[PDB]
Design a protein around this ligand. Structure first.
Ligand SMILES: [Zn+2]
Lengths: 7, 274
């Protein structure tokens, strides 16, 4: 689980 | 269709007594914490001095590798104990004290949950901590205290072995979350109520935890706006208390009948920190 944004 | 008073009654009647809480920057800005997404004039200036192109670059590895000074400018501001919890923190502490808190999941890195007295065993600091740091070149780890003097002196901390920049264990975009995040696997199916306070629910995988509770579980959002999965895919037992987060929390405290216990908790913990 990797931190992400915008999707 | 549930109301805020319905949720307060579920708690008073102990029909809900295993509460999972998710929080974001919205619960820390009443404490004076600079929200990095909406910086104040002083912080904005200091960051602009080192050509921060946009707020999210503070937590991006390519930018950090090129120019770590904006991050360490922000890090200096978040020294442990330079801020005081606010009413939202103490409400969550009261939730714990009353035996209702299953777990508190936070995106914040100010450490104010711990300062308010919520035990570490009840907390998941999902986007990392300043308590440890890792060399960006050789991956050696260090206790966070090893870089604190440098950070407070406006120096970029460098690895004693390879001289690479040492980075606190804050989860940047593209990095793994800490293993403690995996407490969600058991916590969220066990929750009988989900509280969301002061977050935009735009960072993943944190935001998708809102969909991890069972569909019988009410999801109570205390926030300026209906956001994220709560907006995109509402469930029938969702409740939204839209407005200032502190006022929302205070309304819930009043419906619970916890106003005096709150007042007493605040005076007692304000006495601890003064
Ligand atoms: Zn190194």
């Amino acid at each position: 689980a990797r931190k992400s944004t915008g999707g | 269709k549930l109301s805020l008073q319905d949720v307060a009654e579920l708690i008073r009647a102990r029909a809900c007594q295993r509460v999972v809480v998710m929080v974001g920057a919205g619960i820390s800005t009443p404490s004076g914490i600079p929200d990095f997404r909406s910086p104040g004039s002083g912080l904005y200036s200091n960051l602009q001095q080192y050509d921060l192109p946009y707020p999210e670059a503070i937590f991006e590895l390519p930018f950090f590798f090129h120019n770590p000074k904006p991050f360490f400018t922000l890090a200096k501001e978040l020294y442990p104990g330079n801020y005081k919890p606010n009413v939202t923190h103490y409400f969550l502490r009261l939730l714990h004290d009353k035996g209702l808190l299953l777990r508190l999941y936070t995106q914040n890195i100010d450490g104010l949950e711990r300062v308010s007295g919520i035990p570490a065993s009840k907390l998941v600091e999902a986007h990392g901590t300043f308590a440890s740091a890792t060399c960006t070149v050789c991956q050696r780890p260090f206790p966070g205290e090893d870089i604190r003097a440098d950070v407070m002196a406006d120096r970029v901390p460098r690895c004693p072995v390879c001289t690479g920049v040492v980075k606190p264990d804050i989860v940047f975009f593209g990095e793994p979350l800490p293993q403690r995040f995996l407490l969600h696997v058991v916590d969220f199916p066990m929750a009988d109520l989900l509280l969301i306070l002061g977050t935009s629910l735009e960072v993943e995988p944190f935001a998708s935890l809102t969909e991890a509770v069972r569909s019988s579980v009410p999801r109570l959002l205390i926030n300026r706006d209906l956001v994220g999965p709560l907006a995109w895919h509402p469930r029938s037992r969702d409740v939204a208390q839209l407005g200032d987060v502190v006022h929302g929390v205070e309304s819930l405290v009043e419906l619970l009948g916890w106003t005096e216990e709150m007042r007493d908790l605040v005076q007692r913990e304000t006495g601890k920190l003064d």
